[PDB]
Amino acid sequence: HWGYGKHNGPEHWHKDFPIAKGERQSPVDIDTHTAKYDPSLKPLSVSYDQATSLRILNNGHAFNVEFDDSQDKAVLKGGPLDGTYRLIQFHFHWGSLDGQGSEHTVDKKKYAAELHLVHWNTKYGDFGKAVQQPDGLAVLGIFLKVGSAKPGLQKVVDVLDSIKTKGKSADFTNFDPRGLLPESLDYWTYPGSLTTPPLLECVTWIVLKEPISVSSEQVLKFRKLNFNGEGEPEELMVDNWRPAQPLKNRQIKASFK
């Protein structure tokens, strides 16, 4: 029964998920002056040419675009990572207004939204096993600002009317997630957690420096989704972001000078 309301939002999560107060929680504020350039970091390898999207789901907290992860079809490697991470799903976090919505912040700047491309380490065989390991997941985070439309997002925007309420899904085949990337793959990286319950400390975060631009109309359509199920009272799906958590004993490293 966790969510993003006054009564069940992030400040309540610790009562059912005590790791909420742990040593490697996400998101964090990225202090760009304190992040150290690490010349040992490799370019990110994003290999999405053979990606197979299957379905889009409103899970009551966001919408997930799901992929076939039964083979190495859409993988992340290089950057800070050892080995091969398979894309399982992407989703977004967004605000009620354009001045909030991202989970990570940059020098305390909040973006309108944040895209999470979620990948699991093939050495653990399945996502459920991977989330039990400190190097189980790699999440590629991309900021969204409001300006020009993102053409590669529109297929997502246009299906949202069909999954308005919690538990609705729709076929979502042949979607190319390459259309959601910015030009540069310059990134920050740090060790962290899932940003929703169960808040497991299993993520290598890779946050791109360059945002993507989406239109006001695209993000307005995100904000028409519902947290509620069909024939429950309407609660708009907005402000589904966790605030920045303490950095504690962590270093954020930059891939770029």
Binding site: F127, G128, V131, P197, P198, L200
Partner: peptide, 4 residues
């Protein structure tokens, strides 16, 4: 994460 949970099953799912």
């Amino acid at each position: 994460x949970s099953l799912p």
